[PDB]
Amino acid sequence: NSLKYKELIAGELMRITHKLLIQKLQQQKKEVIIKIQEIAKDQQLYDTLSIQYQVDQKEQYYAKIAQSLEDFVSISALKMVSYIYPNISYQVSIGFFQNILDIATKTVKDRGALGCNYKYLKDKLTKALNLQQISYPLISESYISYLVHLFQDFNIIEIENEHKFYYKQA
């Protein structure tokens, strides 16, 4: 029930949904529908849910996914269209995720030659979505790295290989 754990779950779900959304668009008519069984096929999601819950059985794994996805419904990123297992599936709002891409693009573009880092972009996305009706952020660090890497694969962003390190003061 911690706010940090909710964010970590929601961020894996954000990536998965965006990944499915982009796959479906390429292979195709107007709407994109994803099954809960397709959302479930991600190792990090399973590993993240396995931190606090027993999700070795599918139904229990699916239950906990449906629970975390209720917040996605209330912010209009998804809409449930089939309710009765084995047919639990959702329509993805293409505007919601395109808006995420518009905001990410503008944030990094306005920085120009100074550029920015992963925290900055995360705070900026979150401030600009302004989803105060949930009470934890949906944007995790792992979702931001997936976006940054996606942008790099489309030649939009160049990632620096330099890192800072510090002497540990005894």
Site string (98-137) toward Mg ion, x via CB under 5 A: ----------------------------------------
User: Is 92 strand, coil or helix?
Assistant: strand
DSSP 96-146: HHHHHHHHHHHHHHHHGGG---HHHHHHHHHHHH--TTTSS-S--HHHHHH
Burial class (CB in 10 A: 0-12, 13-18, 19+), 136: middle
CB 53 within 8 A of CB 60: yes
Residues 7-66 that bind Mg ion (CB under 5 A): 11-12, 15
Whether residue 11 is annotated as binding a ligand: the answer is yes
Q: Which is nearer to Mg ion, 15 or 64 (CB)?
A: 15
Least distance between Mg ion and beta carbon 170 (Å): 36
CA quadruple 56, 61, 62, 63: dihedral sign: positive
User: By CB under 5 A, how many residues form the interface with Mg ion?
Assistant: 5
Closest distance between Mg ion and the C-beta of residue 140, in Å? 6
72 binds Mg ion, rule: CB under 5 A: no
Q: Does 71 participate in binding Mg ion (rule CB under 5 A)?
A: no
Is 68 a binder of Mg ion (CB under 5 A)?
no
Q: Is 12 annotated as a binding residue?
A: yes
Residue showing tokens 């550029």: 115
Asked if 24 and 32 count as a contact pair (C-beta separation under 8 A), the reply is yes
Instruction: Report whether 95 belongs to an annotated binding site.
Output: no
Q: Is 143 in the site for Mg ion (CB under 5 A)?
A: yes
72 or 143: CB nearest Mg ion: 143
Give me the residues that bind Mg ion (CB under 5 A), please. Answer: 11-12, 15, 142-143
